[PDB]
Amino acid sequence: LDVALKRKYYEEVRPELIRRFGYQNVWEVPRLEKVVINQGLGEAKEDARILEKAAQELALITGQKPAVTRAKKSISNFKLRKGMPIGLRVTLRRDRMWIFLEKLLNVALPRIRDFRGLNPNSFDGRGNYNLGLREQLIFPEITYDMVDALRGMDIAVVTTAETDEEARALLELLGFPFR
Amino acid sequence: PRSLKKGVFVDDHLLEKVLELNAKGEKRLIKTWSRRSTIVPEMVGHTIAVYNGKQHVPVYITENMVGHKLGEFAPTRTYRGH
Amino acid sequence: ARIAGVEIPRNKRVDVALTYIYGIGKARAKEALEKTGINPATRVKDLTEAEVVRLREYVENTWKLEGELRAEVAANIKRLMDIGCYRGLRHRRGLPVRGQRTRTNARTRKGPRKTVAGK
Amino acid sequence: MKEGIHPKLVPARIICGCGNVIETYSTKPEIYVEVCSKCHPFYTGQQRFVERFQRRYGDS
Amino acid sequence: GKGDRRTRRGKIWRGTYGKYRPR
RNA sequence: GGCGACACACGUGCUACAAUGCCCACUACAAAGCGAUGCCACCCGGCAACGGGGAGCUAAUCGCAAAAAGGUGGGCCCAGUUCGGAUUGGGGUCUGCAACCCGACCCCAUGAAGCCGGAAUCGCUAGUAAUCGCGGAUCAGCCAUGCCGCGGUGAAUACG
RNA sequence: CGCGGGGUGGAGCAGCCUGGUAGCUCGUCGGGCUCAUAACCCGAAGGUCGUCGGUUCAAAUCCGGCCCCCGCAACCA
RNA sequence: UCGCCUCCUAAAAGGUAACGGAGGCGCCCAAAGGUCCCCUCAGGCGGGACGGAAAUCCGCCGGAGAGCGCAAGGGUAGAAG
Ligand SMILES: [Mg+2]
Ligand SMILES: [Mg+2]
Ligand SMILES: [Mg+2]
Ligand SMILES: [Mg+2]
Ligand SMILES: [Mg+2]
Ligand SMILES: [Mg+2]
Ligand SMILES: [Mg+2]
Ligand SMILES: [Mg+2]
Ligand SMILES: [Mg+2]
Ligand SMILES: [Mg+2]
Ligand SMILES: [Mg+2]
Ligand SMILES: [Mg+2]
Ligand SMILES: [Mg+2]
Ligand SMILES: [Mg+2]
Ligand SMILES: [Mg+2]
Ligand SMILES: [Mg+2]
Ligand SMILES: [Mg+2]
Ligand SMILES: [Mg+2]
Ligand SMILES: [Mg+2]
Ligand SMILES: [Mg+2]
Ligand SMILES: [Mg+2]
Ligand SMILES: [Mg+2]
Ligand SMILES: [Mg+2]
Ligand SMILES: [Mg+2]
Incomplete structure (x- = not known):
């Protein structure tokens, strides 16, 4: 429960945030709830085994094994029978959010090839931020000696900030590299 | 390309109308045949009428035309696909 | 171990393991092994994690390389x-x-x- | 959490080209990392690695 | 090979000298 | 300016697809022909192209000159690879009034097609065919992989 | 208007019954053999399936209308 | 054409004819059944690797226009989903 960013959030993120927009109540503060990682894998339609290795990999980097999304409706143009698994998706929060998030900023992102920044337009207008990854081996637990194929994910970041600039601020001061 | 230390080469009958304009006060249209010639910094901004083989083509000159000979910008044959 | 970008080389040798870097080969490399005073004919499978971080941070911070180079x-x-x-x-x-x-x-x-x- | 099925998530120590990364709280302690960024290389502490001809040819 | 200008064997072929064919 | 255009089609070629092979070090063995408007030894700068200097020879006297295969030692380990060197970025060098169109060459990065080529189809009977270097003409330079010559090592097989 | 079969690369014909996947002969194109052409040999291209709508996850394929085609039939009067 | 179902014709109870207007049925399901607990849609707008109008994710908006095996009608999330 002592996680450094949870620490750094309360001491030196909240203050700089209160004094930047000016908040009557302590709850009106932008708070960081429920970052959610979603691996869209049509790349496992007929091969079921592609998923079970994918999830052992994703759990290794989140400490939760993910739940498996299954196919909403049946769509023809891609194979897609109406019940199949087409990806993994894990909701992690509440100190598991943090030990994941803190790790991502230190090691994962700076390991991304060519990294000129995180495009700062992914604010969905009600103050949450999503981004997408290409390869899985940018995390520390992935050895390049266990990647059967390269595949990435979408990352949701939910935030109680009613607007985007407060979402912007909460994440910057949290240490998010923008442009 | 051009041997460095030997030029760089601008046909001096052309240079003679640009240091005659950039360091003059008059600065307007020009019309040459010398495509063998390298370029500015002292012609950049003028409008030279280059020659292709058949007639005189207008070119405006900028700083990304660093040291490109004057014919790199007035090509010599016509295609337009089909 | 990994170099510019990731571009992990391995077993073959240490002098060629650098050809397989984009922006480097047989010339921009055979020099940078005496810049780190490193025997070439050894193999990236066995070389001190010490002498790896000379190269890793030498070359990334020497010149334009794989990513920024194609850029x-x-x-x-x-x-x-x-x-x-x-x-x-x-x-x-x-x-x-x-x-x-x-x-x-x-x-x-x-x-x-x-x-x-x-x- | 559902006891059983999760990775163990012990505190860790992790490295980079720079000094050690402290917090780390991870599955599989003691991992190494080619690039973490608090550097003053790599984009934080920005630094680099039209221009040419007006210099080289200018007198020649 | 007789056309790898960056080797001794190819510089002979072309007839030139350089870092890979000195004198 | 064009003869150097490029959706494409054919002829003659070069370099390859590799381990009888690639690379690097050291070390040998030729012939013919050119060259004082030139060929440049040797010294110095330069990774080098080249640039400084500079000695000799109208040349069996001096120079282009290193022949390459080979030899020796060693590295690569069957990999679209240290095979292969196409395309493209950047930096130069010399010829020449001038190198965008449209030159040769050196260097750094790039490493593409190609894992013996469908129907078809060519050359060669002995120092020949294969394979390896060298010179000359033209010629400022050069698009030479071309042409005419030179020697190095050196097969296969013809019942008919 | 009546019953029945059909419309598919340039020609002619499969495929539709039984939804997923368009095939055969010829022609056309590129290249071979030839002095040359045909023959012959080696490669290649080439189509939304009359049409509109519906059905389904998916329509040459199943359904409705329309439109052309062939066929049969209009007898007592 | 011939039996069964749905709508209309049908004149606001029921019923109602024509070689009147339009469609379905001759099955299916061992879970598509019983019950207990839980969940709530289509669609639109913004965001997000390979994701394209629509594979998956996250946000707000969405009272039922979704779903209910198959035709239509009635019904239905306070569930029949
Ligand atoms: Mg919000
Ligand atoms: Mg080679
Ligand atoms: Mg030559
Ligand atoms: Mg040449
Ligand atoms: Mg020579
Ligand atoms: Mg011309
Ligand atoms: Mg010609
Ligand atoms: Mg041309
Ligand atoms: Mg040729
Ligand atoms: Mg040959
Ligand atoms: Mg002689
Ligand atoms: Mg020197
Ligand atoms: Mg000579
Ligand atoms: Mg092989
Ligand atoms: Mg290939
Ligand atoms: Mg030229
Ligand atoms: Mg004979
Ligand atoms: Mg050969
Ligand atoms: Mg010549
Ligand atoms: Mg050329
Ligand atoms: Mg030649
Ligand atoms: Mg020659
Ligand atoms: Mg009668
Ligand atoms: Mg009634």
Whole structure:
């Protein structure tokens, strides 16, 4: 429960945030709830085994094994029978959010090839931020000696900030590299 | 390309109308045949009428035309696909 | 272990394991092993994690490399394209640039042979 | 959490080209990392690695 | 190979000298 | 300016697809022909192209000159690879009034097609065929992989 | 208007019954053999399936209308 | 054409004819059944690797226009989903 960013959030993120927009109540503060990682894998339609290795990999980097999304409706143009698994998706929060998030900023992102920044337009207008990854081996637990194929994910970041600039601020001061 | 230390080469009958304009006060249209010639910094901004083989083509000159000979910008044959 | 980008090389050898880096080969490399005073003919499978972080942070921080390098070549052409340069028309609409004839084989710069019809 | 099925998530120590990364709280302690960023290389502490001809040819 | 200008064997072929064919 | 255009089609070629092979070090063995408007030894700068200097020879006297295969030692380990060197970026060098169109060459990065080629089809009977270097003409330079010559090592097989 | 079969690369014909996947002969194109052409040999291209709507996840394929085609039939009067 | 179902014709109870207007049925399901607990849609707008109008994710908006094996009608999330 002592996680450094949870620490750094309360001491030196909240203050700089209160004094930047000016908040009557302590709850009106932008708070960081429920970052959610979603691996869209049509790349496992007929091969079921592609998923079970994918999830052992994703759990290794989140400490939760993910739940498996299954196919909403049946769509023809891609194979897609109406019940199949087409990806993994894990909701992690509440100190598991943090030990994941803190790790991502230190090691994962700076390991991304060519990294000129995180495009700062992914604010969905009600103050949450999503981004997408290409390869899985940018995390520390992935050895390049266990990647059967390269595949990435979408990352949701939910935030109680009613607007985007407060979402912007909460994440910057949290240490998010923008442009 | 051009041997460095030997030029760089601008046909001096052309240079003679640009240091005659950039360091003059008059600065307007020009019309040459010398495509063998390298370029500015002292012609950049003028409008030279280059020659292709058949007639005189207008070119405006900028700083990304660093040291490109004057014919790199007035090509010599016509295609337009089909 | 990993170098510019990730570009993990391994077993083969240490002098060639650097050819397989983009932006480097046989010349920009065989020098940078005496810059770290490192025997070439050893193998990236066995070499001290010490002498790895000399190279890793030598080369990334020596010159333009795999990512930023391809980054450079790219906008070097949109510089020649979008500008009207002759050498860049042979790019804007896709042909050989420097020299050669096009009444015959350009099949590297010109794509596979697209036969049409004869008189 | 559902006891059983999760990775163990012990505190860790992790490295980079720079000094050690402290917090780390991870599955599989003691991992190494080619690039973490608090550097003053790599984009934080920005630094680099039209221009040419007006210099080289200018007198020649 | 007789056309790898960056080797001794190819510089002989072309007839030139350099770093890979000195004198 | 063009003869150097490029959706494409054919002829003659070069370099390859590799381990009888690639690379690097050291070390040998030729012939013919050119060259004082030139060939440049040797010294110095330069990774080098080249640039400084500079000695000799109208040349069996001096120079282009290193012949290459080979030899020796060693590295690569069957990999689209240290195979292969196409395309493209950047930096130069010399010829020449001038090198964008449209030159040769050196260097750094790039490493593409290609894993013996469908129907078809060519040359060669002995110092020949294969394979390896060298010179000359033209010629400022050069698009020479071309042409005419030179020697190095050196097969296969013809019942008919 | 009546019953029945049909419309598919340039020609002619499969495929539709039984939804997923368009095939055969010829022609056309590129290249071979030939002095040359045909023959012959080696490669290649080439189509939304009359049409509109509906059905389904998916329509040459199943359904409705329309439109052309062939066929049969209009007898007592 | 011939039996069964749905709508209309049908004149606001029921019923109602024509070689009147339009469609379905001759099955299916061992879970598509019983029950207990839980969940709530289509669609639109913004965001997000390979994701394209629509594979998956996250946000707000969405009272039922979704779903209910198959035709239509009635019904239905306070569930029949
Ligand atoms: Mg919010
Ligand atoms: Mg050329
Ligand atoms: Mg040309
Ligand atoms: Mg080679
Ligand atoms: Mg030559
Ligand atoms: Mg040459
Ligand atoms: Mg010579
Ligand atoms: Mg000309
Ligand atoms: Mg000609
Ligand atoms: Mg040739
Ligand atoms: Mg040959
Ligand atoms: Mg002689
Ligand atoms: Mg020297
Ligand atoms: Mg000579
Ligand atoms: Mg092989
Ligand atoms: Mg290939
Ligand atoms: Mg030229
Ligand atoms: Mg004979
Ligand atoms: Mg050979
Ligand atoms: Mg010559
Ligand atoms: Mg030649
Ligand atoms: Mg020769
Ligand atoms: Mg009668
Ligand atoms: Mg009634």
